[PDB]
Amino acid sequence: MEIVEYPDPILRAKNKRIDIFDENLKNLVDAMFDVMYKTDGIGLSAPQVGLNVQLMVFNPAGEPGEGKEIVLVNPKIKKYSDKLVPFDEGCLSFPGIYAEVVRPQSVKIDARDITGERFSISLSRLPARIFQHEYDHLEGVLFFDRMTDQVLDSIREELEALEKKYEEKTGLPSPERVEA
Ligand SMILES: O=C(Cc1c[nH]c2ccc(Br)cc12)NO
Ligand SMILES: [Zn+2]
Ligand SMILES: [Zn+2]
Ligand SMILES: [Zn+2]
Ligand SMILES: [Zn+2]
Ligand SMILES: [Zn+2]
């Protein structure tokens, strides 16, 4: 298994509905949760393992045995709160990079679960926060898109480094450059 990283395009590709709700789907969520636990994270959205399908899993506590291992599939934000708050985020598709992103305090959400049931959770604190972070992955949108002109100024050079690693490995030019 392996985490996809920035500039890699699978990060921007349209993400599909899921509809069979089979056993493979259980099996996927093992491996998303386990890769998460292995890289010490608190969320992970499926295109970060190379699958373009709306599926995110996560667990605020982010340590085994602790918190609560939530799964949303086909999320949609019904509502976003007015309240706005900063927070240093990291994202695994950007090894080692943390920069402050500013986002809505709470969200209401509609979504299916691992057996198909729709449902309807609201969400705050860290939970909500991650939710959104993975919620963006589902939808083409990476954390530095959410940063303020100044902040991004602080990571230009790092994400540039990434673009080059991609370029060295792939032979191809970086399908997207942050000087853009
Ligand atoms: O790469 C990841 C997981 C992750 C790791 N460290 C974090 C700190 C803040 C936030 Br919000 C998310 C993370 N999700 O796409
Ligand atoms: Zn592997
Ligand atoms: Zn299908
Ligand atoms: Zn497991
Ligand atoms: Zn930890
Ligand atoms: Zn991420």
PDB file of N, CA and C in Angstrom, residues 31-91:
ATOM      1  N   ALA A  31      -7.407  -1.157   5.588  1.00  0.00           N
ATOM      2  CA  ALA A  31      -6.155  -0.548   5.237  1.00  0.00           C
ATOM      3  C   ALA A  31      -6.171   0.960   5.317  1.00  0.00           C
ATOM      4  N   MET A  32      -7.246   1.682   5.020  1.00  0.00           N
ATOM      5  CA  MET A  32      -7.025   3.085   5.343  1.00  0.00           C
ATOM      6  C   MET A  32      -6.753   3.241   6.850  1.00  0.00           C
ATOM      7  N   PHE A  33      -7.561   2.616   7.696  1.00  0.00           N
ATOM      8  CA  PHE A  33      -7.315   2.940   9.106  1.00  0.00           C
ATOM      9  C   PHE A  33      -5.854   2.476   9.416  1.00  0.00           C
ATOM     10  N   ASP A  34      -5.456   1.312   8.906  1.00  0.00           N
ATOM     11  CA  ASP A  34      -4.168   0.886   9.406  1.00  0.00           C
ATOM     12  C   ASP A  34      -3.024   1.749   8.880  1.00  0.00           C
ATOM     13  N   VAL A  35      -3.066   2.185   7.672  1.00  0.00           N
ATOM     14  CA  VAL A  35      -2.013   3.026   7.189  1.00  0.00           C
ATOM     15  C   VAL A  35      -2.016   4.260   8.020  1.00  0.00           C
ATOM     16  N   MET A  36      -3.223   4.678   8.420  1.00  0.00           N
ATOM     17  CA  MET A  36      -3.310   5.940   9.257  1.00  0.00           C
ATOM     18  C   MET A  36      -2.564   5.844  10.596  1.00  0.00           C
ATOM     19  N   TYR A  37      -2.856   4.707  11.227  1.00  0.00           N
ATOM     20  CA  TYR A  37      -2.249   4.358  12.490  1.00  0.00           C
ATOM     21  C   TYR A  37      -0.777   4.157  12.399  1.00  0.00           C
ATOM     22  N   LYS A  38      -0.373   3.671  11.226  1.00  0.00           N
ATOM     23  CA  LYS A  38       1.045   3.366  10.937  1.00  0.00           C
ATOM     24  C   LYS A  38       1.752   4.672  10.680  1.00  0.00           C
ATOM     25  N   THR A  39       1.126   5.633   9.968  1.00  0.00           N
ATOM     26  CA  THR A  39       1.841   6.891   9.768  1.00  0.00           C
ATOM     27  C   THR A  39       1.441   7.865  10.839  1.00  0.00           C
ATOM     28  N   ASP A  40       0.697   7.419  11.877  1.00  0.00           N
ATOM     29  CA  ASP A  40       0.433   8.255  13.092  1.00  0.00           C
ATOM     30  C   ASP A  40      -0.516   9.403  12.712  1.00  0.00           C
ATOM     31  N   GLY A  41      -1.552   9.212  11.872  1.00  0.00           N
ATOM     32  CA  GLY A  41      -2.427  10.359  11.501  1.00  0.00           C
ATOM     33  C   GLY A  41      -3.812  10.410  12.153  1.00  0.00           C
ATOM     34  N   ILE A  42      -4.764  11.190  11.637  1.00  0.00           N
ATOM     35  CA  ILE A  42      -5.991  11.199  12.439  1.00  0.00           C
ATOM     36  C   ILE A  42      -7.084  11.142  11.489  1.00  0.00           C
ATOM     37  N   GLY A  43      -6.773  11.260  10.206  1.00  0.00           N
ATOM     38  CA  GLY A  43      -7.702  11.034   9.110  1.00  0.00           C
ATOM     39  C   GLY A  43      -6.990  10.445   7.874  1.00  0.00           C
ATOM     40  N   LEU A  44      -7.751   9.997   6.887  1.00  0.00           N
ATOM     41  CA  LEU A  44      -7.118   9.669   5.599  1.00  0.00           C
ATOM     42  C   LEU A  44      -8.213   9.405   4.582  1.00  0.00           C
ATOM     43  N   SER A  45      -8.159  10.061   3.445  1.00  0.00           N
ATOM     44  CA  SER A  45      -9.214  10.062   2.483  1.00  0.00           C
ATOM     45  C   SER A  45      -8.749   9.170   1.327  1.00  0.00           C
ATOM     46  N   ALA A  46      -9.691   8.541   0.685  1.00  0.00           N
ATOM     47  CA  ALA A  46      -9.218   7.461  -0.126  1.00  0.00           C
ATOM     48  C   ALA A  46      -8.285   7.815  -1.311  1.00  0.00           C
ATOM     49  N   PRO A  47      -8.533   8.988  -2.001  1.00  0.00           N
ATOM     50  CA  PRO A  47      -7.513   9.202  -3.082  1.00  0.00           C
ATOM     51  C   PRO A  47      -6.124   9.301  -2.476  1.00  0.00           C
ATOM     52  N   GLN A  48      -5.949   9.449  -1.167  1.00  0.00           N
ATOM     53  CA  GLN A  48      -4.531   9.451  -0.752  1.00  0.00           C
ATOM     54  C   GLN A  48      -3.904   8.008  -0.749  1.00  0.00           C
ATOM     55  N   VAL A  49      -4.683   7.012  -1.083  1.00  0.00           N
ATOM     56  CA  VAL A  49      -4.074   5.741  -1.252  1.00  0.00           C
ATOM     57  C   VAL A  49      -4.284   5.311  -2.691  1.00  0.00           C
ATOM     58  N   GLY A  50      -4.696   6.241  -3.505  1.00  0.00           N
ATOM     59  CA  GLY A  50      -4.669   5.986  -4.935  1.00  0.00           C
ATOM     60  C   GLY A  50      -6.055   5.552  -5.408  1.00  0.00           C
ATOM     61  N   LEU A  51      -7.114   5.614  -4.570  1.00  0.00           N
ATOM     62  CA  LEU A  51      -8.482   5.319  -5.009  1.00  0.00           C
ATOM     63  C   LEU A  51      -9.426   6.522  -5.181  1.00  0.00           C
ATOM     64  N   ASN A  52      -9.766   6.899  -6.421  1.00  0.00           N
ATOM     65  CA  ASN A  52     -10.619   8.040  -6.512  1.00  0.00           C
ATOM     66  C   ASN A  52     -12.135   7.881  -6.219  1.00  0.00           C
ATOM     67  N   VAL A  53     -12.494   7.616  -4.964  1.00  0.00           N
ATOM     68  CA  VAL A  53     -13.877   7.306  -4.615  1.00  0.00           C
ATOM     69  C   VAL A  53     -14.143   8.071  -3.341  1.00  0.00           C
ATOM     70  N   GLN A  54     -15.349   8.605  -3.110  1.00  0.00           N
ATOM     71  CA  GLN A  54     -15.603   9.390  -1.853  1.00  0.00           C
ATOM     72  C   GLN A  54     -15.542   8.480  -0.704  1.00  0.00           C
ATOM     73  N   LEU A  55     -14.357   8.335  -0.100  1.00  0.00           N
ATOM     74  CA  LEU A  55     -14.352   7.610   1.163  1.00  0.00           C
ATOM     75  C   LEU A  55     -13.350   8.150   2.139  1.00  0.00           C
ATOM     76  N   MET A  56     -13.750   8.541   3.368  1.00  0.00           N
ATOM     77  CA  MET A  56     -12.742   9.089   4.273  1.00  0.00           C
ATOM     78  C   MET A  56     -12.760   8.332   5.562  1.00  0.00           C
ATOM     79  N   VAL A  57     -11.699   8.160   6.331  1.00  0.00           N
ATOM     80  CA  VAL A  57     -11.971   7.482   7.655  1.00  0.00           C
ATOM     81  C   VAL A  57     -11.228   8.341   8.533  1.00  0.00           C
ATOM     82  N   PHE A  58     -11.503   8.286   9.815  1.00  0.00           N
ATOM     83  CA  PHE A  58     -10.658   9.010  10.661  1.00  0.00           C
ATOM     84  C   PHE A  58     -10.847   8.789  12.230  1.00  0.00           C
ATOM     85  N   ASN A  59      -9.974   9.390  13.096  1.00  0.00           N
ATOM     86  CA  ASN A  59     -10.101   9.117  14.479  1.00  0.00           C
ATOM     87  C   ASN A  59      -9.343  10.095  15.291  1.00  0.00           C
ATOM     88  N   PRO A  60     -10.005  11.178  15.740  1.00  0.00           N
ATOM     89  CA  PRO A  60      -9.481  12.311  16.461  1.00  0.00           C
ATOM     90  C   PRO A  60      -8.479  11.968  17.455  1.00  0.00           C
ATOM     91  N   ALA A  61      -8.612  10.827  18.062  1.00  0.00           N
ATOM     92  CA  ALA A  61      -7.678  10.590  19.127  1.00  0.00           C
ATOM     93  C   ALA A  61      -6.298  10.346  18.472  1.00  0.00           C
ATOM     94  N   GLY A  62      -6.398   9.767  17.243  1.00  0.00           N
ATOM     95  CA  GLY A  62      -5.356   9.298  16.419  1.00  0.00           C
ATOM     96  C   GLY A  62      -4.363   8.452  17.122  1.00  0.00           C
ATOM     97  N   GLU A  63      -4.740   7.645  18.081  1.00  0.00           N
ATOM     98  CA  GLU A  63      -3.797   6.669  18.557  1.00  0.00           C
ATOM     99  C   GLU A  63      -4.570   5.378  18.675  1.00  0.00           C
ATOM    100  N   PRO A  64      -3.894   4.204  18.527  1.00  0.00           N
ATOM    101  CA  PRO A  64      -4.761   3.030  18.703  1.00  0.00           C
ATOM    102  C   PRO A  64      -5.322   3.019  20.081  1.00  0.00           C
ATOM    103  N   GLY A  65      -6.584   2.573  20.106  1.00  0.00           N
ATOM    104  CA  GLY A  65      -7.222   2.026  21.312  1.00  0.00           C
ATOM    105  C   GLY A  65      -7.993   3.150  21.949  1.00  0.00           C
ATOM    106  N   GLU A  66      -7.838   4.329  21.323  1.00  0.00           N
ATOM    107  CA  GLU A  66      -8.192   5.630  21.875  1.00  0.00           C
ATOM    108  C   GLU A  66      -9.153   6.254  20.873  1.00  0.00           C
ATOM    109  N   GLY A  67      -9.848   7.336  21.245  1.00  0.00           N
ATOM    110  CA  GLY A  67     -10.860   7.975  20.359  1.00  0.00           C
ATOM    111  C   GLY A  67     -11.958   7.033  19.833  1.00  0.00           C
ATOM    112  N   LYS A  68     -12.275   7.122  18.538  1.00  0.00           N
ATOM    113  CA  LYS A  68     -13.475   6.533  17.965  1.00  0.00           C
ATOM    114  C   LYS A  68     -13.149   6.532  16.441  1.00  0.00           C
ATOM    115  N   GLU A  69     -13.132   5.334  15.830  1.00  0.00           N
ATOM    116  CA  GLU A  69     -12.640   5.189  14.333  1.00  0.00           C
ATOM    117  C   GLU A  69     -13.941   5.365  13.470  1.00  0.00           C
ATOM    118  N   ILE A  70     -14.273   6.656  13.144  1.00  0.00           N
ATOM    119  CA  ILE A  70     -15.465   7.122  12.271  1.00  0.00           C
ATOM    120  C   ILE A  70     -15.250   6.833  10.753  1.00  0.00           C
ATOM    121  N   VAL A  71     -16.295   6.427  10.043  1.00  0.00           N
ATOM    122  CA  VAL A  71     -16.109   6.372   8.559  1.00  0.00           C
ATOM    123  C   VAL A  71     -17.222   7.187   7.814  1.00  0.00           C
ATOM    124  N   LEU A  72     -16.859   8.121   6.952  1.00  0.00           N
ATOM    125  CA  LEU A  72     -17.885   8.675   6.110  1.00  0.00           C
ATOM    126  C   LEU A  72     -17.616   8.297   4.722  1.00  0.00           C
ATOM    127  N   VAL A  73     -18.687   7.942   4.088  1.00  0.00           N
ATOM    128  CA  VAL A  73     -18.596   7.701   2.734  1.00  0.00           C
ATOM    129  C   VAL A  73     -19.702   8.495   2.135  1.00  0.00           C
ATOM    130  N   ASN A  74     -19.465   8.898   0.899  1.00  0.00           N
ATOM    131  CA  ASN A  74     -20.256   9.908   0.243  1.00  0.00           C
ATOM    132  C   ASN A  74     -20.689  11.080   1.201  1.00  0.00           C
ATOM    133  N   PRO A  75     -19.765  11.736   1.928  1.00  0.00           N
ATOM    134  CA  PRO A  75     -20.123  12.891   2.751  1.00  0.00           C
ATOM    135  C   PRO A  75     -20.685  13.939   1.898  1.00  0.00           C
ATOM    136  N   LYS A  76     -21.363  14.925   2.495  1.00  0.00           N
ATOM    137  CA  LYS A  76     -21.686  16.244   1.901  1.00  0.00           C
ATOM    138  C   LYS A  76     -21.872  17.160   3.083  1.00  0.00           C
ATOM    139  N   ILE A  77     -21.268  18.338   3.028  1.00  0.00           N
ATOM    140  CA  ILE A  77     -21.544  19.298   4.073  1.00  0.00           C
ATOM    141  C   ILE A  77     -22.943  19.923   3.783  1.00  0.00           C
ATOM    142  N   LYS A  78     -23.913  19.693   4.667  1.00  0.00           N
ATOM    143  CA  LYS A  78     -25.212  20.351   4.633  1.00  0.00           C
ATOM    144  C   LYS A  78     -24.917  21.754   5.089  1.00  0.00           C
ATOM    145  N   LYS A  79     -24.212  21.905   6.202  1.00  0.00           N
ATOM    146  CA  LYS A  79     -23.983  23.254   6.675  1.00  0.00           C
ATOM    147  C   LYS A  79     -22.638  23.475   7.323  1.00  0.00           C
ATOM    148  N   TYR A  80     -22.197  24.696   7.119  1.00  0.00           N
ATOM    149  CA  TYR A  80     -21.026  25.230   7.701  1.00  0.00           C
ATOM    150  C   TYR A  80     -21.367  26.331   8.705  1.00  0.00           C
ATOM    151  N   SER A  81     -20.724  26.324   9.859  1.00  0.00           N
ATOM    152  CA  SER A  81     -20.949  27.409  10.791  1.00  0.00           C
ATOM    153  C   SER A  81     -20.288  28.754  10.367  1.00  0.00           C
ATOM    154  N   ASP A  82     -20.802  29.916  10.807  1.00  0.00           N
ATOM    155  CA  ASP A  82     -20.166  31.265  10.674  1.00  0.00           C
ATOM    156  C   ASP A  82     -18.798  31.380  11.442  1.00  0.00           C
ATOM    157  N   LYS A  83     -18.794  31.157  12.811  1.00  0.00           N
ATOM    158  CA  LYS A  83     -17.475  30.906  13.624  1.00  0.00           C
ATOM    159  C   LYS A  83     -16.312  30.321  12.746  1.00  0.00           C
ATOM    160  N   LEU A  84     -15.193  31.072  12.745  1.00  0.00           N
ATOM    161  CA  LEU A  84     -13.914  30.794  12.019  1.00  0.00           C
ATOM    162  C   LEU A  84     -12.717  30.787  13.004  1.00  0.00           C
ATOM    163  N   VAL A  85     -11.716  29.908  12.750  1.00  0.00           N
ATOM    164  CA  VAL A  85     -10.660  29.488  13.774  1.00  0.00           C
ATOM    165  C   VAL A  85      -9.401  29.029  13.098  1.00  0.00           C
ATOM    166  N   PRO A  86      -8.207  29.425  13.616  1.00  0.00           N
ATOM    167  CA  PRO A  86      -6.980  28.831  12.935  1.00  0.00           C
ATOM    168  C   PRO A  86      -6.554  27.460  13.528  1.00  0.00           C
ATOM    169  N   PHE A  87      -5.652  26.815  12.793  1.00  0.00           N
ATOM    170  CA  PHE A  87      -5.077  25.547  13.218  1.00  0.00           C
ATOM    171  C   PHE A  87      -4.058  25.059  12.313  1.00  0.00           C
ATOM    172  N   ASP A  88      -2.987  24.605  12.913  1.00  0.00           N
ATOM    173  CA  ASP A  88      -1.913  24.187  12.145  1.00  0.00           C
ATOM    174  C   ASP A  88      -2.503  22.906  11.683  1.00  0.00           C
ATOM    175  N   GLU A  89      -2.456  22.657  10.361  1.00  0.00           N
ATOM    176  CA  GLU A  89      -2.769  21.341   9.800  1.00  0.00           C
ATOM    177  C   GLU A  89      -1.498  20.755   9.226  1.00  0.00           C
ATOM    178  N   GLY A  90      -1.419  19.409   9.206  1.00  0.00           N
ATOM    179  CA  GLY A  90      -0.510  18.701   8.291  1.00  0.00           C
ATOM    180  C   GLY A  90      -1.271  17.765   7.343  1.00  0.00           C
ATOM    181  N   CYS A  91      -0.637  17.307   6.292  1.00  0.00           N
ATOM    182  CA  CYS A  91      -1.425  16.430   5.459  1.00  0.00           C
ATOM    183  C   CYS A  91      -0.392  15.460   5.081  1.00  0.00           C
TER     184      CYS A  91
END
